[PDB]
C-alpha cells in the first residue's frame, strides 16, 4: 500500500536494470510516500505497475520518455510537499515515440505546488483541463506554465479521448 525516488533528472547509473527497479518498487503501491519520478525510459517500456498508484505525497516527475501513456489513472491526489524547482507539484518535460497523453482522470486535488509542462511534441489535451479547479482553495497563486482530436462530447475539459473526462 505504501512506497520512492529523489534522484531528480539524474541520468540512471544502472540503465540496463531500470524498469525492474521501478517495477518492484511501485507494484501494488497505493500511496507513494515521497516522489514519483519517471525518467529515461524507451519506447517499449510497460509502466503497467502504475495503475495501482492513487496518491503521491511529494512531487511528480515525467521527463525524457519515449513512452506514450502513463497509466496514472488512479492518482486522485498529490499532496505537494517536496516541490520540484521549489514550486512545481507536477513536472513533465522532454517527452519526445513520445508522451501522447497523461491519463490522470482521477486527479482532482493539488494542495501545494504549481504545474510545469514543457517540451512535449506529442502530448495532447494538457491545455483542456482547468488546473484552477484542481488547485486547492489556498493553492490559488500556484504557477501554471504550459506546441490532436477534440475531447469527447460527453465531457468539455479532457485528459484523454474516450468519454478520460475531467
Amino acid at each position: 500500500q505504501v512506497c520512492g525516488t529523489d534522484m531528480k533528472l539524474r541520468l540512471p547509473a544502472s540503465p540496463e536494470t531500470h524498469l525492474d527497479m521501478l517495477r518492484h518498487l511501485y507494484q501494488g503501491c497505493q500511496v507513494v510516500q515521497g516522489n514519483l519520478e519517471l525518467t529515461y525510459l524507451p519506447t517499449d517500456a510497460s509502466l503497467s505497475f502504475l495503475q495501482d498508484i492513487q496518491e503521491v505525497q511529494g512531487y511528480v516527475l515525467i521527463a525524457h520518455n519515449q513512452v506514450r501513456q502513463v497509466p496514472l489513472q488512479r492518482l486522485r491526489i498529490v499532496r505537494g510537499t517536496q516541490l520540484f524547482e521549489d514550486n512545481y507539484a507536477l513536472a513533465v518535460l522532454d517527452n519526445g515515440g513520445g508522451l501522447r497523453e497523461l491519463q490522470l482522470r482521477s486527479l482532482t486535488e493539488i494542495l501545494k505546488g504549481g504545474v510545469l509542462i514543457q517540451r512535449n511534441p506529442q502530448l495532447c489535451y494538457q491545455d483542456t483541463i482547468l488546473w484552477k479547479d484542481i488547485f486547492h482553495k489556498n493553492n490559488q497563486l500556484a504557477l501554471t506554465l504550459i506546441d490532436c482530436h477534440p475531447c469527447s462530447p460527453m465531457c468539455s475539459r479532457c485528459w484523454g479521448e474516450s468519454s478520460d473526462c475531467q
Binding site: 521549489d86 514550486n87 497563486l141 504557477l143 501554471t144 506554465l145
Partner: protein, 123 residues
C-alpha cells in the same frame, strides 16, 4: 526563457531579479502580482522602475497586497496610479474583511458605499 526564471520575484531573490532586468517585466500572472502578494518591497519598487504594470490583471497587485496585509507595498502601489477601487470585490473589501485598520484607514483617502451586494462594512 528568462520569463520563467523571473517569476525569482516569487521567492524574493532580489539579486537575481536585478541581474535579470539588466538583461520582459510584464511576463505572464505577473512578477509584480507575486512580489506584492508575498511582500517584497524592493522587488516591487525595482519592478515599477523597469516600467511594470501597476493595474495589471490576473486580480491586481494592489488587491493582493491589500488582502495579505502589506502596508508599505500598498502605499507604493496606490501612489503609482493604482485603482483604489474581480468577483465584485475591491481592495477596501479584502482589507476590511481581514481586520486591516491601517490599510482601511490609509485607503479610505476608496468608496465605502461584492456580487452579493456585500459592502466592506458587512464584512
Amino acid at each position: 526563457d528568462l520569463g520563467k526564471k523571473l517569476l525569482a520575484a516569487r521567492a524574493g531573490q532580489d539579486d537575481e531579479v536585478r541581474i535579470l532586468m539588466a538583461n520582459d517585466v510584464n511576463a505572464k500572472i505577473t512578477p509584480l502580482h507575486l512580489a506584492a502578494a508575498y511582500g517584497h518591497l524592493e522587488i516591487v519598487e525595482v519592478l515599477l522602475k523597469h516600467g511594470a504594470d501597476v493595474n495589471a490583471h490576473d486580480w491586481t497587485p494592489l488587491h493582493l497586497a491589500a488582502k495579505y496585509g502589506h502596508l508599505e507595498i500598498v502605499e507604493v502601489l496606490l501612489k503609482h496610479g493604482a485603482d483604489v477601487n474581480n468577483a465584485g470585490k475591491t481592495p477596501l473589501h479584502l482589507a476590511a474583511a481581514h481586520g486591516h485598520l491601517e490599510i482601511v484607514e490609509v485607503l479610505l483617502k476608496a468608496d465605502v458605499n461584492d456580487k452579493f451586494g456585500k459592502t466592506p462594512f458587512d464584512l
